[PDB]
């Protein structure tokens, strides 16, 4: 509705996650869930989502782009500049990032921007 | 719940400027309206590439836009794949997307 339209226009950062080389896939899935649970009430954060990569189809109609193996995709929404700064200044966020350090081997962030 | 999601990394053709690509992303989005079997479509530009991560940074080269498709069920997905307008839509994708990486995702919570 109106809500989803304005939400889509928030500050959004999308992440490609690669699990640590030594961590099992089973454990990585559990730590993704813990990381989502830890996001509840995170100051300044409007929404968090984390998903596993379940499939890597290669029969594309466009030339295929190989980026190596990605294990999960994360995404953060912030409603405003002020809320992003609340988040960046938060000690609760710093603890969340400590947990990230445990279960994320490598990370690619994209800050996105809306069109129409 | 039965929801299927596919996320795409899009690189523009070398024959296109960034502005030309932006305009074709808008066209692609407009084309997608009322697409058979599709629940939601989103396309957005990559505006920034922060590199001060607190874990090791992963370089995947230059990604220009992110697309995402939602399908409410497996049945909706098959209606989409057999649609003639979806096939024409994919032809437009061949025009404005130089390279792309699809990810089929799975929900965790």
């Amino acid at each position: 509705p109106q809500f989803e339209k304005i939400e889509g226009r928030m500050i959004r950062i999308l992440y490609l996650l690669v699990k640590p080389e030594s961590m099992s896939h089973e454990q990585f899935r559990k730590e993704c869930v813990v990381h989502f649970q830890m996001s509840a009430g995170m100051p300044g954060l409007h929404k968090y989502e984390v998903r596993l990569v379940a499939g890597n189809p290669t029969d594309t109609h466009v030339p295929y782009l190989d980026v190596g193996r990605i294990d999960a995709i994360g995404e953060c929404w912030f409603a405003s500049e002020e809320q992003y700064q609340v988040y960046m200044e938060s000690d609760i966020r710093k603890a969340w990032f400590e947990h990230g350090k445990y279960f994320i081997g490598q990370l690619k962030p994209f800050v996105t921007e809306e069109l129409v | 719940g039965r929801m299927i999601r596919i996320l795409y990394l899009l690189v523009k053709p070398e024959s296109m400027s960034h502005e030309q690509f932006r305009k074709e992303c808008v066209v692609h989005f407009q084309m997608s309206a009322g697409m058979p079997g599709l629940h939601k479509y989103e396309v957005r530009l990559v505006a920034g590439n922060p590199t001060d991560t607190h874990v090791p940074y992963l370089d995947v080269g230059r990604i220009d836009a992110i697309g995402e498709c939602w399908f409410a069920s497996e049945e909706q997905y098959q209606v989409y794949m057999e649609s003639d307008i979806r096939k024409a839509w994919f032809e437009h994708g061949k025009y404005f997307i130089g390279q792309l990486k699809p990810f089929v995702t799975e929900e965790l919570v």
Binding site: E4, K5, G8, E114, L115, V116 | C25, V26, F29, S32, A33, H39, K40, Y41, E42, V43, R44, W70, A72
Partner: peptide, 5 residues
């Protein structure tokens, strides 16, 4: 840009 049912 997005739409949804």
């Amino acid at each position: 840009a997005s739409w949804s049912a």
